[PDB]
Design a binder for these strands. Structure first.
Lengths: 397, 11
RNA sequence: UGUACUAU
């Protein structure tokens, strides 16, 4: 498919200038062998005219730029030429970057949803001058196509790149779009949509990676976090039990810099539902994270619910501990409760937040007494073996 | 399968 | 004894 003047009975002394002068660059850039050569050729020594030809033939013609950006091989050359254009501070630098934004902006949604063109979008978002990259964010769709971008395996990384390298003032509309209850439901029910929400939450958190923000930027960040968190906690039960969004609830509940939302999550959808949620494949991990990071006043309510919150079965006498200890998912919650109590009485976890040290001793004594009485049944399972050994190493220390 | 138990009161 | 994502 390559032109015959370059073919070998590709040659060996084929230079980049031969390809640029010939006008056949589009044929090489879509062929695997040809584009691999162009990949290496543009890394060598380029004269000013050679850069000029590359700037016109690769990122100067909209239709050719689109064809190469959506190409399996050609998209690599576009990213390389964009880098050379951004690295060449000649008199055409401004005109080239302005034209490149218009090329991308005019086909934002189609390029975003494309497997290879979305790589060109991500490269431009993080490499172009910040003033020009913000103009790309304005070209993002605001309707259902934005949802299609967030739930696409490839397009979702464009939004992730926007979140990572663009100031929040330019993509605050994405937060409000995701915060819309119907949009949050559809996005957080998708494995890739959850990755978008997770990245946005991390960016909107006042953690160590955001101390460089100004006061105005921090205030804008806190406003967007409250609007998204409000919509998140209203679907708290749906997200905590979802196969993908349960990781998001785990993060909100475990992240230290989101501690004020720990209380909101636990009381809204976890309290008075610990036994049921502990028996779910996905919600049990959230229950684990809640026990591990709950404030001591709320941890007490959680422990009392497992120990004394449920009426035992009227026929057998099974209580909540009897059910969770031998459930395929609930046993991990009990192991977590035991580990928490063992860490407290051993000095590994601070008990003092009143001093809840005596509270941890009551729960440990409850767990120790039950594990002692059920040691034979528990010794059949790996979880019971862990619990018995967990209590065993404590008595030695 | 799930083994659910009736809750107690909070008063 | 128990889940995602990490995409040319």
């Amino acid at each position: 498919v390559l032109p015959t003047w370059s073919l070998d009975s590709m040659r060996s002394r084929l230079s980049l200038s031969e390809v640029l002068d010939s006008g056949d660059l589009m044929k090489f850039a879509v062929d695997k062998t040809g584009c691999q050569f162009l990949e290496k050729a543009v890394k060598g020594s380029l004269t000013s005219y050679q850069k000029f030809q590359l700037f016109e033939q690769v990122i100067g013609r909209k239709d050719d730029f689109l064809k190469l950006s959506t190409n399996i091989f050609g998209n690599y050359l576009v990213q390389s030429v964009i880098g050379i254009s951004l690295a060449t501070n000649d008199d055409g630098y401004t005109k080239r970057q302005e034209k490149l934004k218009n090329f991308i902006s005019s086909q934002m949604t189609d390029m975003c949803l494309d497997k290879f063109a979305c790589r060109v979008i991500q490269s431009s978002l993080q490499n172009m001058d910040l003033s020009l990259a913000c103009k790309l964010v304005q070209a993002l769709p605001r309707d259902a196509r934005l949802i299609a971008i967030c739930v696409d395996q490839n397009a979702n990384h464009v939004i992730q790149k926007v979140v990572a390298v663009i100031p929040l003032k330019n993509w605050e509309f994405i937060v409000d779009f995701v915060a819309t209850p119907e949009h949050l439901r559809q996005i957080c029910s998708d494995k890739y949509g959850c990755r978008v929400v997770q990245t946005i939450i991390e960016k909107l958190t006042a953690d160590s990676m955001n101390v460089d923000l100004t006061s105005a930027a921090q205030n804008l960040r806190e406003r967007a976090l409250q609007r998204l968190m409000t919509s998140v906690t209203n679907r708290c039960q749906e997200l905590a039990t979802n196969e993908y969004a349960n990781y998001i609830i785990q993060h909100i509940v475990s992240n230290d810099d989101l501690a004020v939302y720990r209380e909101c999550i636990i009381e809204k959808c976890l309290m008075r539902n610990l036994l049921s949620l502990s028996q779910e494949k996905f919600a049990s991990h959230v229950v684990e994270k809640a026990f591990l990071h709950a404030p001591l006043e709320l941890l007490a309510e959680m422990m009392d619910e497992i120990f004394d919150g449920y009426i035992p079965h009227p026929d057998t006498g099974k209580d909540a501990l009897d059910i969770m200890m031998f459930h395929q998912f609930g046993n991990y919650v009990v192991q977590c409760m035991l580990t928490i109590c063992c860490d407290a009485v051993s000095g590994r976890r601070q008990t003092k937040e009143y001093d809840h040290a005596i509270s941890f001793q009551d729960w440990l004594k409850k767990l120790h007494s039950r594990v002692t009485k059920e040691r034979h049944r528990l010794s059949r399972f790996s979880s019971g073996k862990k619990m018995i050994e967990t209590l065993a190493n404590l008595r030695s220390t | 399968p799930k083994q659910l138990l009736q809750l107690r009161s909070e008063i």
